[PDB]
Amino acid sequence: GYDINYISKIGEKIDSNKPIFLFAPELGAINLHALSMSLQSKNL
Amino acid sequence: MNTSDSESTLYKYLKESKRKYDEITLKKVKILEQIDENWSKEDLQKLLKGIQEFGADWYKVAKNVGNKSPEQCILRFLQLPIEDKFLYGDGNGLGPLKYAPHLPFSKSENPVLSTIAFLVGLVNPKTVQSMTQRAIQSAESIKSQYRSHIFATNEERQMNFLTNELIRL
Amino acid sequence: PLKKVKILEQIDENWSKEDLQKLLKGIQEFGADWYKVAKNVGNKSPEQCILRFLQLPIEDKFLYGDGNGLGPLKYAPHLPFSKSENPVLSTIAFLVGLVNPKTVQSMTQRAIQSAESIKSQKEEISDQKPIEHIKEGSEIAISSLGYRSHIFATNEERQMNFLTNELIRL
Amino acid sequence: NIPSLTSFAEENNYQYGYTYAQQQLNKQRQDFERVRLRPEQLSNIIHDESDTISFRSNLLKNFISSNDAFNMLSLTTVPCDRIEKSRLFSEKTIRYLMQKQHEMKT
Amino acid sequence: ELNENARELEQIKPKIALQDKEITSVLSNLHESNKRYRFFKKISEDPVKALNECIASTSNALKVLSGDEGYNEDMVRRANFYKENEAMLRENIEVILSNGRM
Amino acid sequence: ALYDYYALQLLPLQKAVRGHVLQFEWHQNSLLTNTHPNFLSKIRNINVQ
């Protein structure tokens, strides 16, 4: 019932500008010890 | 919508509808029955009165209840069956309404598919499979009166054998 | 208690014994062309002939007269008390009007097969609920859709064989 | 360069703590294995067909290809006795197999 | 003779290329017809389960193309969802409360 | 029914926390390979080295 070519054309931009996760310049000071201790934390 | 109102849209519209046709021709949510042994009726009452007292400050809420951690208060507030007695089903199926914000069906675009989407919940699949396989076998019994279903003529079987012969040669 | 005799004589609303005889003549003689069947009866539509051949009512409101077995069909909009459009029954009639009615008589025991088999079938479909007619008609419609899908599948297989022979010649 | 296998040993290399020949060999080691193992920061990052595959374009194409093939099924009101079968051979495949069968006796 | 055979190869090559064009164009149609044969056979085998997989993979095909995400709204609205998922909620409530976001 | 009304008073705030906690639970499902499945990481072809 929709014109889904236009819907997908807009939804591509929506998926591109969606806040999924951090980018490379906005990660801050990556601490390897914090990552290595969080991987052994058996959380999710 | 008040039918007792003589000046609403409902009264005039329904009277005109029935006149045009003849012209041309309670279920209350008993919330305190969740009294499972870790909680109690007084605990649920103090929980509800505390959340009405203080909005979502769970430390004050668990303080008002007493003898329970705030995590149990938040969990029992999540697991309350408040709106389940106003929804449709118990747990056949809701059909396409189960996929609520995304409905890719149009009466003009797919008149048949929407009615079929509403209809597939009622029927049993075993009798449907039985009837369509009986239709297939009845069509085969009519048509009969190796891939001989496609290659039915003797001409096309000899053409296929000629193709295999020329390939091998 | 009177809904039972209401659907029992709403199936047989305005169909006499002579209209039934002309209907069965047009059904057993002509194959899958319901327009000439309706002209053989004369004063009825091909859709009405299909729904009488399936022993179904019309107007869509004598089925599911309330609105619990009908899940979402209660929540369907309509034109109230007038302008009767029948999406369920016209969908069922459109799906059964494509599938060669002799094999539809082979498909179910409920459908009318001869002029000597009207009374026993009318007796054996009695004492049924209005949801049962919806259930049986939707089963017949979905099975006819599956049969038509099987025919389209065999035609696509024939198309793939044609493309295979074109590949071999190339 | 092409330094050694002894320069790759753990004794001559640093570890988690908490001479001149070693500090000379580790110059050539880090100058050799950083021009060898460095990734390509340019194009030809496609690498194959199954990395630049697009889920959105295939999902859109399957949404169209299901919808029109279902409109081919239901809405086409041609009865089953009236669906005419397609030819299992072409107008050119029927000529080539008349030609080769004529030339098969040689 | 080498240049003669080279001229014959360069004469015979474009007729091979024009045949390869049609070979690929028939292979694409063979794959397209295979898709429709599979879609017409899985329906005809079971017309209630394929007619539930055809709907549940059409609205889900619209949710991804639109860009929306999340749980099913009509699933998480009931109370038995939070009773079968009793394990992850006691983790997440403590995680959000201890971090101070609840 | 006074405490039914208490349960009929604070129900959509409970649904608001049931939405944000579920949203954060969905945030726990962030893996960056469920998302774009092509994350091209790092390659290098055959060098003369």
Added chain:
Amino acid sequence: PLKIHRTPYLTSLKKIKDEIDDPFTKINTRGAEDPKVLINDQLSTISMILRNISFSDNNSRIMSRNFYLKRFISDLLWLVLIHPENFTCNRKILNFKKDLVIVLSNISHLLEIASSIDCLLILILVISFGQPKLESLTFNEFQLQWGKYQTFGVDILAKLFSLEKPNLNYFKSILLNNHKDKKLLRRLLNLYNRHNLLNDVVSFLFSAIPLQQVLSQPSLLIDQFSPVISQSLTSILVIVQKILPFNFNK
């Protein structure tokens, strides 16, 4: 083991393109809707991280002397080849092979192969890139207008043959012929359908030497493919001189 899943590269590409272009596809069922796809998308992140880390001069020798990483490599290479039924998608199974070969291309100059089963699964993984035929050479030549992923395998085999310690001993005992893997190796060797392994490895190493392509059209192609040609010839010379010299019958 019941069946060594030796699917080639191109059939894997066709299976991927026929699974994506399916109407009832489950390739985007999300993460929170299924825990098995959550485990698979954690493992794919682990493999992408481990193939990303190994492009440094210090990490390539630290990852080489890491019993945990060698056990994880010998643990995944079993699962992706012998029982791949647990991985949900068919693109994840190709992507595990596509970064295991990359992470083994940077390590293998210092790798000491632990067990013989790992030394057989390395061979089957490297063989699984390339196209076979339908004795003679059982590998049609791989033309490099498709993808250079088979050129990574002929360097794993060129660097892992350079130790006469455990590497070449394990390769010798595999190609020519601590108490349960004797039963496992003798089960895996006759599940691979004498001396089919040797002629398969040598015929694959005669592939990725583009004789037909550089001799069809003159200096650019050999200047581009000199390292893969050099390492393939080194591997074939090692196999000829130090493995072939009696239980043969052909």
Added chain:
Amino acid sequence: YRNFMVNSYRLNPNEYFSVTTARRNVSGDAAALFRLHKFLTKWGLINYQVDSKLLPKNIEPPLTSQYSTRHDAPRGLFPFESYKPSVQLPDMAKLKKM
């Protein structure tokens, strides 16, 4: 031993709780106490805030702030929806009947 070390750190968190005071105050071999202290300080839990620093000041852009949420914002997640009431007069009659 663990409760002793954790209780003894949390009396004055600005001080590095050394291994030697833990060895001098509970009776046991130095190897196991050293291993337990290094495991404990590996996971935070002790000596986590010895030299603490102050975050100076945050010049906050809009929508990155507490109470920076609007009803007009899109609910990407938060799967509960707000639905449009359909006011049609036959649907009004249907709602009155149902």
Added chain:
Amino acid sequence: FSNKEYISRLWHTLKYYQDLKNTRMKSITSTSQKIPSASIWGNGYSGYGNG
């Protein structure tokens, strides 16, 4: 719930995320000019142990 509303919803969703990306870029350029601004996500750690 028709098409003309379902696309107008997507226009009143993309224009939100474009302003959100403008905020995300400005909060990156602020910290790159040595000004400690907050991001879409919270500030990660403090001076406690981790940096």
